Amino acid sequence: TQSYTNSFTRGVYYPDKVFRSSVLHSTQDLFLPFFSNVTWFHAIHVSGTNGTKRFDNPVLPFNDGVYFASTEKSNIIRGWIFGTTLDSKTQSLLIVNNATNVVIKVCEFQFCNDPFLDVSELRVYSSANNCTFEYVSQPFLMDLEGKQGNFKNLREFVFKNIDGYFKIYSKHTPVNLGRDLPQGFSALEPLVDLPIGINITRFQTLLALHRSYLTPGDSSSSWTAGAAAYYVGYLQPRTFLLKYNENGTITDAVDCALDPLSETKCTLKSFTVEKGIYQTSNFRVQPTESIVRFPNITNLCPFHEVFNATRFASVYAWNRTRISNCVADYSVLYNFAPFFAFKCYGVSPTKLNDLCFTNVYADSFVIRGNEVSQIAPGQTGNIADYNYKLPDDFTGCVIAWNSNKLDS
């Protein structure tokens, strides 16, 4: 089943490894919005034997990391699944824990369900085709029992893939007595880091379907109630102001984008705001779309003619060509010359195809190797002051390549 809940104030980790005490340092990073929407999920496989099929597995989006929180008895949940497009068309992740082990792969895994047969492997992937990376060692989660189920363990996991170095920000809080996401505040610390490099926009997890229990069935949806005992949250980039305790932990924190009171507490570095008016920021109407109005031209102005020529003029008599109304793509010219030197000036060639010019001028000639760099705005010598000079305010750029094969 699926149900909604209110995040309250949770999902706060230490942004850095560094220690603080009685400081109110603020930071910008991925975090959980306070009092945000959190989605419960439950997988019913108890009746799988008597046919009827589980039929309960959505494809959870992963966009900008995921927050994880749940309560499993010993190992009811095992691992998670990343990737995109499912099929071998693109890669996928296979993070899963084993007793006191963890195995990570980025192989192109094609599958249909999430049944990690055990209470083994397989059933959740069918292609070890072109695996690129693997990893092992100590698992993330350590189980602790209070000799009874009253101390419901809560495993808060912060999951991110920002330029690799995948984060295991986690903590154990078995202080729960039954209430879902109890009021309070705890922090999260990292365990390991590792880079892979992969476009993840899909999330799935692994449950123990071979022996499951307490999975009631109903049609709860669209902001309804239902017991799932498995929470998932998504992160968005925010600014947070954190209260570091005297001991060094995090006692409490406030958002900087949720409520104007919190915005005040963030813009003036204090948890307490007295009576008065304060200035925080502005408000700007965001653009709905982007309009382009480049002139409706299609005739590609001749650049092959000027570049790939056979009678390039001398430096003392340079060959000047005017460019008129045309849409010029400055990306098909890379195969027109060896391009020994393609340095460019205040206009950079990279996003040169998104600009409009009054008029474009090209001048082609030949010079010696020791003077290939002599042509620049304000250079002096023989050619640079006698045959061709560039003005100091010149905008544009020069193209150079060796013609020793032909002009020999």
Binding site: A257, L258, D259, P260, L261, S262, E263, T264, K265, F271, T272, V273, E274, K275, G276, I277, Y278, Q279, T280, S281, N282, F283, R284, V285, Q286
Partner: protein, 135 residues
């Protein structure tokens, strides 16, 4: 239609309720208009439809007008100050009370002369020095 944003709040240990003031903008145009990923301040959870008063310094969100005028606590501008008022606690924005309205009994022959006085001690706190420092 950008502009400054000001938060009007009483002391944090008096309430957690604030009234937002937008600087120099009429609400009927932009600050009422709000959507996800449309205005840079994402604290826009405020209704923009309740307790919407219009002030020459830009209109105010979160407090309702009161005809009554008192010595004003949180200055706003254009003779407007909002303050916390017990209804049962909400932020109210009113026009400044200039002071106790008083009259005099001027006549071409009447005079007023005191018969008993009152010695009162006041305090004027004048700084004379600041923390000397060297860099």
């Amino acid at each position: 239609s950008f502009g400054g944003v000001s938060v009007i709040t009483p002391g944090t240990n008096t309430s957690n309720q604030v009234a937002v003031l937008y600087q120099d903008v009429n609400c009927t145009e932009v600050p009422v208009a709000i959507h996800a990923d449309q205005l840079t301040p994402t604290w826009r959870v405020y209704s923009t439809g309740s307790n919407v008063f219009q002030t020459r310094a830009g209109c105010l969100i979160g407090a309702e007008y009161v005809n009554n005028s008192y010595e004003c606590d949180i200055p706003i501008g254009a003779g407007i100050c909002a303050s916390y008022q017990t209804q049962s606690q909400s932020i109210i924005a009113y026009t400044m009370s200039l002071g106790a309205e008083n009259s005099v009994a001027y006549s071409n022959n009447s005079i007023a002369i005191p018969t008993n006085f009152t010695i009162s001690v006041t305090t004027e706190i004048l700084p004379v020095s600041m923390t000397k420092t060297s860099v």
